[PDB]
């Protein structure tokens, strides 16, 4: 137990994947679909309304106009009324 044989140095065994990978951990590209055609969406953009069923609530960090997750949509009859008494319908 005094000695520690089999030092087993690791050099190119970790370089073999690439050198910038051992300084920066790289990024994950999304999966490409077919019905989506060629619109390569990323993981930090959403310009359409989503559905909030058993999903997570997204967060925003700066600028970059985004869509939303619809929680309630309803149509009723538009009653006549303003912020006052002027209610002419002639």
């Amino acid at each position: 137990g005094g000695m520690t044989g089999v030092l087993f140095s690791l050099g190119a065994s970790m370089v073999l994947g690439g050198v910038a990978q051992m300084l920066a951990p790289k990024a994950r590209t999304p999966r490409i679909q077919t019905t989506d055609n060629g619109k390569q969406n990323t993981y930090f953009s959403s310009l359409d309304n989503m559905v909030a069923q058993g999903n997570v609530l997204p967060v925003l960090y700066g600028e970059m106009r985004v869509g939303s997750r619809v929680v309630s949509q309803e149509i009723s009859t538009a009653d006549e009324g303003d912020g006052g008494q002027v209610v002419v319908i002639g």
């Binding site: 310009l47 309304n49 985004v66 149509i75």
Partner: protein, 49 residues
């Protein structure tokens, strides 16, 4: 003549820590399809030094 009167109560359920926007539009000049709502908002209040 008088017609049916309706007493309405709004939503008492408030949202504690979620940002939200409510939009009402006459939706007459729009097409028969739905309308997409995109909002150009700022970021989140951070704990900056």
């Amino acid at each position: 003549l008088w017609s049916s009167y309706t007493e309405i109560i709004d939503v008492k359920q408030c949202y504690p820590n979620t940002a939200l926007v409510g939009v009402q539009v006459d939706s007459e000049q729009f097409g028969s399809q739905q309308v997409s709502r995109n909002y150009h908002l700022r970021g989140r209040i951070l704990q900056v030094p």
